Amino acid sequence: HGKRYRALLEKVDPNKIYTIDEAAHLVKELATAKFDETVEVHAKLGIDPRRSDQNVRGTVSLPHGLGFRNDKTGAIHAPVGKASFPPEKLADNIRAFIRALEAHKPEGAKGTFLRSVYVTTTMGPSVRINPH
RNA sequence: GUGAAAUACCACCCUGGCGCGGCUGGGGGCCUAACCCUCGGAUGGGGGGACAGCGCUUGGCGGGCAGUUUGACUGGGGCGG
Ligand SMILES: [Mg+2]
Ligand SMILES: [Mg+2]
Ligand SMILES: [Mg+2]
Ligand SMILES: [Mg+2]
Ligand SMILES: [Mg+2]
Ligand SMILES: [Mg+2]
Ligand SMILES: [Mg+2]
Ligand SMILES: [Mg+2]
Ligand SMILES: [Mg+2]
Ligand SMILES: [Mg+2]
Ligand SMILES: [Mg+2]
Ligand SMILES: [Mg+2]
């Protein structure tokens, strides 16, 4: 852990829960990268991956453009693009792919479908945030 | 590049571990002051001691007791059927 991270996670809270349009203006500032950042928001998933009847995939494309699947640990990963679009074209876009993801929920998925969501980068720290 | 997986700063997760803390269940030891026993004497001393005893509750063992059941046919009834 370098010092770019020492002022990264000192400037943001994994302690305090946040919302999605509140924390989406902080997405380009908290990446100190030397180049080429791509922003990744993540969610833990409320399904049992050992049951393949609960599995999901497809190709659905973001409104903006470049520039979703469940693994055997039952969590979520997906690229939305390249750094590109600024805070207000992201907070605008930050509700776009999530609600497009909720439409894949298998029936036998027991419990809260999106367990916890931290907005982060490939370059950046943990921020408690709400998909809402 | 002879394994399909890429060996970066990252979160999101699995799996176990310890670390702190929040809620916590469980054990041991010591104490005394409730409670108990005792003390020619006591607003006290000694002994036991949060046990025991007692309340409410759980499940159990339980002829020591209680209420009862223990069929009809039948060349008498039972036995047999
Ligand atoms: Mg003692
Ligand atoms: Mg005394
Ligand atoms: Mg005493
Ligand atoms: Mg007691
Ligand atoms: Mg009996
Ligand atoms: Mg009797
Ligand atoms: Mg009677
Ligand atoms: Mg008879
Ligand atoms: Mg006859
Ligand atoms: Mg006769
Ligand atoms: Mg007879
Ligand atoms: Mg008979």
Swiss-Prot record:
**Molecular function GO terms recorded:** rRNA binding; structural constituent of ribosome; tRNA binding
Q: Which organism is it from?
A: Thermus thermophilus
Q: Which GO terms describe its biological process?
A: regulation of translation; translation
Q: What is this protein called?
A: Large ribosomal subunit protein uL1
Query: What family does this belong to?
Result: Belongs to the universal ribosomal protein uL1 family.
Q: Known InterPro entries for this protein?
A: Ribosom_uL1_bac-type (IPR005878), Ribosomal_uL1 (IPR002143), Ribosomal_uL1-like (IPR023674), Ribosomal_uL1/biogenesis (IPR028364), Ribosomal_uL1_3-a/b-sand (IPR016095), Ribosomal_uL1_CS (IPR023673)
GO cellular component terms, semicolon-separated: large ribosomal subunit
Gene name, Swiss-Prot/TrEMBL = rplA
Q: Which UniProt keywords apply?
A: Repressor, Ribonucleoprotein, Ribosomal protein, RNA-binding, rRNA-binding, Translation regulation, tRNA-binding
The protein's assembly and partners: Part of the 50S ribosomal subunit.
Under the heading PROSITE patterns, the entry gives: RIBOSOMAL_L1
Entry function: The L1 stalk is quite mobile in the ribosome, and is involved in E site tRNA release. Binds directly to 23S rRNA.
